[PDB]
Every structure is written in structure tokens, then in C-alpha cells.
Design a protein around this ligand. Structure first.
Ligand code: SF4
Length: 888
């Protein structure tokens, strides 16, 4: 039974059948000092205590957090639900279908492969900015989306019928996280007579955006989410919690976006990988839910697992504003208050006992952007011109473009729409109001509109060759931009709505005008994209922009109007007004107070009701998609999108022990901050690549390639796409190239081709890497890929959280250098042959010996961090383990 059953009591004696586990009846003073993020873990353990998956000791360990956070203690966590998008959602449903095949093969019941919690999937990663700056651009983009992705859509739609508990939010509805915040989020569950906190994992690294609403959620690989949907607890080392104390007031010109870029930079410096961050202090109460969500969104960019803002009265106000049901609201606040999970940030006596506290005085926040090449590279708006011009001549890097000083004032004329324009270094060519990060925030969306109106009335324009776009994460945005009268002015500046999906945020940015591309390449220009996103890594916004700056939506507009980031907005006007002459940014910038009025006036629950009323059913094209009635997927050999994966080939019920990796070759020698984009690119498929050759062989032209993310249900493409990022910096080649050296022959080959040779010869492979290996996107293809290339281990200085978990899930060993040790320090070339000794008895975090064919030996930490992770390793993977459990 549940040992804590006595804690269950009615919330309200008027409705005696609706109960909750009352953590206050624990009568334990440790509870009242817990970070509110830890209280969520505690509750989930108590309600789920069976003495099997979740044990009474587990509850004590979580309660004893203040002590046990230092004792490397694993705990279970069963979240309330799972959220997915289509890029990671396709391979997830392929995994499920493949697991059903495997379970049937072994004589099990394939209906056991079925989500036992709610799964919501939002289709947002497929639409691209094929067209912009026109009224019909949205329809034209929506049409191409469906035309390009029909098979994937029919497949997801079948998935939503063939597996229990799956709701799909169709194309043209907005973006996962914004839809989560405005519609999908429960805050408090009311299931089978028990209230409990909403919590989740999502197959997207920015799932942490939900934490702004006091919902404990974070990103995970699909394989981890798959296990969770099947009832497997998350296994984690009980985390330390950094208290981020906010104080002061932001200046009225400062935006949510300025604040998050400031905090991102701040927390990467601090180092919070493997930890929760939990916000508190007098400064939190002034932040709206949208503001808190902006900050929480960027959790993976600063490294943490969670960035938590507990539920307070501001959260409740957001729920009433977004039109949540009256009945539900009643028990959300009432439940949180009764259980001790309801916050008042204005009461220091209620502040938890965090591991340590770090501080931000919001008055120190200045208007800012981040770039040109990393989310943590904060640049004051006041210093944008200076910093870029410094970048022009600096050695090629995150803060260098390496342009000879003589050319810093280069410019190229070009003709666009029979008018001559001049492009130069720092010219803005992409200006996209994009990303759930910011479009969920009416302060910056209306800010952007009010700036647009001011500018238009002031007689300002955006040059017509500039690829401006507006890509909202829900239709509520457009609705209030129209009601408020600001949308026509956005339209005139070139910010018509182009789609309701990720779009430019994810690199789905579409073509630049031919004459603009010409000038850029012919002139050797550093052309600039400015976007309200959370990621700006070289090449991931557009192939032709060497500089990308994250900035608030109104700044996106400001740089569009100015047409360059090499501008001192204080010193230089934007243009000349036909009457009062000089028009400066200051004159057109809306104040916090002018924004708050329009927001208070135009963002009412009725709009949310209206937008979301028909969300699941309105898409006639979706509704039209025919699906088979099958429960077991009819794999089609003709498909280039959907393919039965080899993962479970010849799977046996019984386990055989792990053997050492013997005389492994190093497939790639990598450096620092290798992103999952480098490991498993998701955008354009290059004409000179293994994946292009495969698709060509199958009779497709480049225009039919689609993106890598779109091909994730086809392991044949995805293996070929592994380490195929054209900006991979393999230290074997000392240059950017998606290649490596096949050492036996000395030949330089595309990475997949080189791996084939090694695999044909029966040779094991490893990867050497530096710090922060696997940063960024949650994509488990950055683990499945290497697994299919024959990679048995990685040896790195440090790992990012989601990536490490995906490696473990695929049975690949994540090895870590000992402190003060790395490739240079050990004198490794990567051209040696590597023996990793696996002992008969394994322990989490154990050190193993690595032996080289040269005689050199050293030690590495084996980063299986919990007993459960070790069982995954012994099983050859997390889904292997789950098939075995379900087959018997
Ligand atoms: S790619 Fe951008 S818009 Fe899409 S879910 Fe991620 S953060 Fe949001």
C-alpha cells in the first residue's frame, strides 16, 4: 500500500471526495525550509509511494534535502505529464512503434507500450519563413508546411490514435511552450479524487519555460520521456538548489528580454549544471508570469536543470487572465495554500534555506543584446556599435570575425525591386520577432507594436530588402495586436504574421533575397540577423548571417528601422520627421507605463477563450488526414521519412555482462562547447553530404530533402547526418569541416563514411571532447546517431545535463576526465588506440582505467550517476530495459 495514506484528506468538506496528501500533517519542521522546487519532488514521492518504485526511505531522503543534497543520493521522480513537439515527437512515436514490435517478438503484450500519463504534442517545428512581408505570407507558409510534411503529419496523427493519452495540437496553432503556458498547463491536477501539482518533462530543452508559472518542468531526450510515459520514474541525484534573489526595480525602458540575457550571462559564470535554480526576493513580485517565463525559458542556455518561480498571487492572476475555469482556479490556490506550496515573495520569513544565494539588483539591468555568436555574450545597446566594430578585426571566434582592418568600412551596392541599396558590415538583413521566449510576453509584443505606431507616425520605414518577420507562439498575440490597433503599423514596417511556429528561432528562416545574398558574398560582408530568440550560434539562424544578436521585440524593430547594428541610438537619429526634423529612438520608445495600460486594456480572458476554443479541431487540413486503424505500425519500405529502427534488432530477454572496449579508435577529436547542433544538425541537408547522397539515391532533388529534424523518423538519414554540421571543428583537421580522418588509411572522409569503414572492420569507436560537451537542444539523435556510427564511449571534460542522460539511455559510456586532467594535460593525440576496462562489478561514478596501445594509462570517471542509470547500461539502453520489463 501507500505508507502515507493517512495524509490524504479532503481539501473542502463541502466536496469530501476531492482529497490531497497533506504534507503539513508530516508535522516535520524540515518541510517549511525546503526550496519550493524540492516540495514538488517530495509530494510526487509521497503520493506515489508503493515500496517498490518509490520507497519510504525515498520520502525521508527528499525531506532531509538540506543534508542529503551533499550526499550524492538518488531519488525517484514521477512527473504529472509529458509534453512534446513534432521534431522530437516523430522519432518518439517511431520508438513506441518499434518497442511494440519488439515486445510482440518476445511474446509480450504490445498494448503495454502505451502512455500512462497525459502526453500533449504541439506541431511547431515544421513551418518555415518561405515568404514574408505580405498579408498572404502566412497562408503561403502554411501551405508549404503541409505539402512538405504530409507523411510526418499522417504518422503523428496515427500515433495519437494508436497510443493512449496523446493529444495533438495541430499545425498553425503556435509554439509548444507558449501553448503550454496559455492552455495546456494544469498548475494543479484533479485526477481520480486527488489534487497534486502539475509537473512535467518535455522533449525540448526549453520546457523549463513553464517553471515561470510555478510548474516544475524540464527538458529531456525522447528516450527518457518515452520511459516516463511508460511509468518509469525519473532517476536523479537529489539536486542542490541555488537561490537567485531578485531585488530593486528595472528602469522603465528595460524589458523582460534585457533581464533574461543579463541572468543568462550571470549564471553561466556561476556554473549551475546539474542544479536547480529557484528565484526569490522582493524583485520577483513585480515580474509578471510572462516575465518569469522569459527568464525560466533560457535555463538550458545558462546550464541548470530548473529555473523555478513558485506559484504566488501573480500566477493566479495570470490563470484568471488566460481564462482558466472558475471552478479550477478555486482549488488551485486553495490546494497550494493547504499543502504549503503557495508563495508570497514579499515575505522573507517564507524564503527557503537554499544551498547558496546569488543576487541580482534589477536596477543594474540595461537595455542589451547578446551575440554575435553565443546567448551568454551580453552587449549593452549603448555598446553594440563599439563591440561589433571590435569584433570586425578580432581573431576569428565568438567575439571575432577576422576582417582585415582596411575593409571595416566596405560596402556593396545592390538592386532590390529596381531600387539601389548599399549593404555593409553590420547591415541588418534578418529582423525576426520570433520565439516562445518572447512572443508569450505581451509587454514586449505590445512594446514592439507601440514602437511601430510611434515610428510610422514619425514617418519612419524599414528598407524593403530586409527580411522582417513576426512568428507568434499563439493566435492570442495577433488578436491583441489587432484589437489594440497596432498591427497595421507592424505590417507597414514588414512585420505581418508569417506563421505560428518556431520559424526563425530554430533556423527555419527561409531564403534571403538573391541580390542581398550576392552583395554579402561578393563584398565579404558581416551581415547581421537580429531576433527575439534564445540561441544565436554561428550558422543556426541563417547561412548568410555571420552575426546574430538576441534582443527584445522592440529592439528587433529598432534595428530594422535603423537597418544596421553599428549605431549609437543616442548620438544618431533614425531618420528625419517632415516637421520636427530629427527622430531619435528615445522619441519613439514606449515607456513601461504606456505599455502597461495597453496590456491591461487589451489582454482579456475572452481572447484566450476565443483563440483556444477550437484549437484541436479547427485545422481542416489536419482533420482531413486519413490514418490507418492499425495498432502495430505498417512500416513502408518506400518511405524516406518513416523507417523501422535497428535499435531492438535481435534483442534477447536475458542480459550478458558488459565487456571492455578493446583497442578503440578515436573517430573525432573535439574541443569545447560542442553543441547538439554540431552532433546532430537539424536544418538544411548539404548537397555534399552522406545524407544527400542517400536521398539522391532514393530519387529526391535538393528542394525535396527537407530538414534533418524532419528526417528523424529515418535512422538511415540521421546516422548519415551525425557530425555532419558544416561548422564542426574536428581537431584532427584543425578546420571547420564535417569530416574526420580514417586513421588506418589516412583518408579524410565525411564522418559517417569514416565510421562505416571502421565498423566494417569490426573496430570499436570513441569520441574525445572538451568542456560542456552536448550543450543545447535535447535531441536524443545526438546520442542515437553516435550509437549507430559505432561509438561505444565519449571521453570529455564535462557534459551538459540532457546530453549525458541521452548517452546513458543509448548504452554509450560517458567518461569524464578527473579534475585537473584533459587531453593536453595527459598528452593524448587521439591517434592512439583506447582500451577502457570494464570490471565485473560496477558502481555509479566509479573510476575506470583507460589503457593506450602506447603503454600510457590514466583514469576516467564513468558517468553513470545512479543505480538505475547503471541498470540502463547493463540493459544496453533505457528502452531495451523497458521492453524487457514489459515483455515479462
Ligand atoms: S525553437 Fe524557439 S520557438 Fe521553438 S520551442 Fe524552442 S525556444 Fe520556443
Amino acid at each position: 500500500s501507500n505508507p502515507f495514506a493517512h495524509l490524504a484528506e479532503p481539501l473542502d468538506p463541502v466536496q469530501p471526495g476531492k482529497k490531497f496528501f497533506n504534507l503539513n500533517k508530516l508535522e516535520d519542521s524540515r518541510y517549511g525550509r525546503l526550496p519550493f522546487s524540492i516540495r514538488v519532488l517530495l509530494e510526487a514521492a509521497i503520493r506515489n509511494c508503493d515500496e517498490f518504485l518509490v520507497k519510504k526511505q525515498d520520502i525521508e531522503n527528499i525531506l532531509h534535502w538540506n543534508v542529503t543534497q551533499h550526499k550524492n543520493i538518488e531519488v525517484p521522480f514521477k512527473p504529472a505529464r509529458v509534453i512534446l513537439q513534432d521534431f522530437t515527437g516523430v522519432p518518439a512515436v517511431v520508438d513506441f512503434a518499434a518497442m511494440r514490435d519488439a515486445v510482440k517478438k518476445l511474446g509480450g503484450d504490445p498494448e503495454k507500450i502505451n502512455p500512462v500519463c497525459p502526453a500533449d504534442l504541439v506541431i511547431d517545428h515544421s513551418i518555415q519563413v518561405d515568404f514574408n512581408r505580405r498579408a498572404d505570407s502566412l497562408q503561403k507558409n502554411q501551405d508549404l508546411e503541409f505539402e512538405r510534411n504530409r507523411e510526418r503529419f499522417e504518422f503523428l496523427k496515427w500515433g495519437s490514435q494508436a497510443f493512449h493519452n496523446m493529444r495533438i495540437i495541430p499545425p498553425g496553432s503556435g509554439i509548444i511552450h507558449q501553448v503550454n503556458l496559455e492552455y495546456l498547463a494544469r498548475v494543479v491536477f484533479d485526477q481520480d479524487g486527488y489534487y497534486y501539482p502539475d509537473s512535467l518533462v518535455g522533449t525540448d530543452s526549453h520546457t523549463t519555460m513553464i517553471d515561470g508559472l510555478g510548474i516544475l518542468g524540464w527538458g529531456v531526450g525522447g528516450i527518457e520521456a518515452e520511459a516516463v510515459m511508460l511509468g518509469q520514474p525519473i532517476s536523479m541525484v537529489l539536486p542542490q538548489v541555488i537561490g537567485y534573489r531578485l531585488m530593486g526595480k528595472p528602469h522603465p525602458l528595460v524589458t523582460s528580454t534585457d533581464i533574461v540575457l543579463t541572468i543568462t550571462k550571470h549564471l553561466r559564470q556561476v556554473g549551475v549544471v546539474g542544479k536547480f535554480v529557484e528565484f526569490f526576493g522582493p524583485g520577483v513580485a513585480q515580474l509578471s508570469i510572462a516575465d518569469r517565463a522569459t527568464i525560466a525559458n533560457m535555463c538550458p542556455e545558462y546550464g541548470a536543470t530548473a529555473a523555478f518561480f513558485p506559484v504566488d498571487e501573480v500566477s493566479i492572476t495570470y490563470l484568471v487572465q488566460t481564462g482558466r475555469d472558475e471552478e479550477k482556479l478555486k482549488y488551485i490556490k486553495k490546494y497550494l495554500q493547504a499543502v504549503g506550496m503557495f508563495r508570497d515573495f514579499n515575505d522573507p520569513s517564507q524564503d527557503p534555506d537554499f544551498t547558496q544565494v546569488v543576487e541580482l539588483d534589477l536596477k543594474t539591468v540595461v537595455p542589451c543584446c547578446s551575440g554575435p555568436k553565443r546567448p551568454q555574450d551580453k552587449v549593452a545597446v549603448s555598446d553594440m556599435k563599439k563591440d561589433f566594430e571590435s569584433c570586425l578585426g578580432a581573431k576569428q571566434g565568438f567575439k571575432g570575425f577576422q576582417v582585415a582592418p582596411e575593409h571595416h568600412n566596405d560596402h556593396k551596392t545592390f538592386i532590390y525591386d529596381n531600387t539601389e541599396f548599399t549593404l555593409a558590415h553590420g547591415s541588418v538583413v534578418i529582423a525576426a520577432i520570433t520565439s516562445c521566449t518572447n512572443t508569450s510576453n505581451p509587454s514586449v509584443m505590445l512594446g514592439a507594436g507601440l514602437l511601430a505606431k510611434k515610428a510610422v507616425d514619425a514617418g519612419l520605414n524599414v528598407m524593403p530588402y530586409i527580411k522582417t518577420s513576426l512568428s507568434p507562439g499563439s493566435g492570442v498575440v495577433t488578436y491583441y495586436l489587432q484589437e489594440s490597433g497596432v498591427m497595421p503599423y507592424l505590417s507597414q514596417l514588414g512585420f505581418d504574421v508569417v506563421g505560428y511556429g518556431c520559424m526563425t528561432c530554430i533556423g527555419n528562416s527561409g531564403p534571403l533575397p538573391e541580390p542581398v545574398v550576392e552583395a554579402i558574398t561578393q563584398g565579404d560582408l558581416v551581415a547581421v540577423g537580429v531576433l527575439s530568440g534564445n540561441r544565436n550560434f554561428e550558422g543556426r539562424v541563417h547561412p548568410n548571417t555571420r552575426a546574430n544578436y538576441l534582443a527584445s521585440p522592440p529592439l528587433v524593430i529598432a534595428y530594422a528601422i535603423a537597418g544596421t547594428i553599428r549605431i549609437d541610438f543616442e548620438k544618431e537619429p533614425l531618420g528625419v520627421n517632415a516637421k520636427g526634423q530629427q527622430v531619435f529612438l528615445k522619441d519613439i520608445w514606449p515607456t513601461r507605463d504606456e505599455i502597461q495600460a495597453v496590456e491591461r486594456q487589451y489582454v482579456i480572458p475572452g481572447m484566450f477563450k476565443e483563440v483556444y476554443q477550437k484549437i484541436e479541431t479547427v485545422n481542416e487540413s489536419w482533420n482531413a488526414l486519413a490514418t490507418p486503424s492499425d495498432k502495430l505500425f505498417f512500416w513502408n519500405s518506400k518511405s524516406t521519412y518513416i523507417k523501422s529502427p535497428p535499435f531492438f534488432e535481435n534483442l534477447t530477454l536475458d542480459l550478458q555482462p558488459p565487456k571492455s572496449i578493446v583497442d578503440a579508435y578515436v573517430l573525432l577529436n573535439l574541443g569545447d562547447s560542442v553543441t547538439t547542433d554540431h552532433i546532430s544538425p537539424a536544418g538544411n541537408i548539404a548537397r555534399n553530404s552522406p545524407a544527400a547522397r542517400y536521398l539522391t539515391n532514393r530519387g529526391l532533388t535538393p528542394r525535396e530533402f527537407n530538414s534533418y529534424g524532419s528526417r528523424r523518423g529515418n535512422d538511415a538519414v540521421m546516422a548519415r547526418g551525425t557530425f555532419a554540421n558544416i561548422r564542426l571543428l574536428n581537431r584532427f583537421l584543425n578546420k571547420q569541416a564535417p569530416q574526420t580522418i580514417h586513421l588506418p588509411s589516412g583518408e579524410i572522409l565525411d564522418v559517417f563514411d569514416a565510421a562505416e569503414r571502421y565498423q566494417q572492420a569490426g573496430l570499436p569507436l570513441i569520441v574525445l571532447a572538451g568542456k560542456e560537451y552536448g550543450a543545447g537542444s535535447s535531441r536524443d539523435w545526438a546520442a542515437k546517431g553516435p550509437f549507430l556510427l559505432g561509438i561505444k564511449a565519449v571521453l570529455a571534460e564535462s557534459y551538459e545535463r540532457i546530453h549525458r542522460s541521452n548517452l546513458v539511455g543509448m548504452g554509450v559510456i560517458p567518461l569524464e576526465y578527473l579534475p585537473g586532467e584533459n587531453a593536453d594535460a595527459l598528452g593524448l593525440t587521439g591517434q592512439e588506440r583506447y582500451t577502457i576496462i570494464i570490471p565485473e562489478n560496477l558502481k555509479p561514478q566509479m573510476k575506470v582505467q583507460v589503457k593506450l596501445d602506447t603503454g600510457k594509462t590514466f583514469q576516467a570517471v564513468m558517468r553513470f550517476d545512479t543505480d538505475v542509470e547503471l541498470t540502463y547500461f547493463l540493459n544496453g539502453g533505457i528502452l531495451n530495459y523497458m521492453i524487457r520489463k514489459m515483455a515479462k
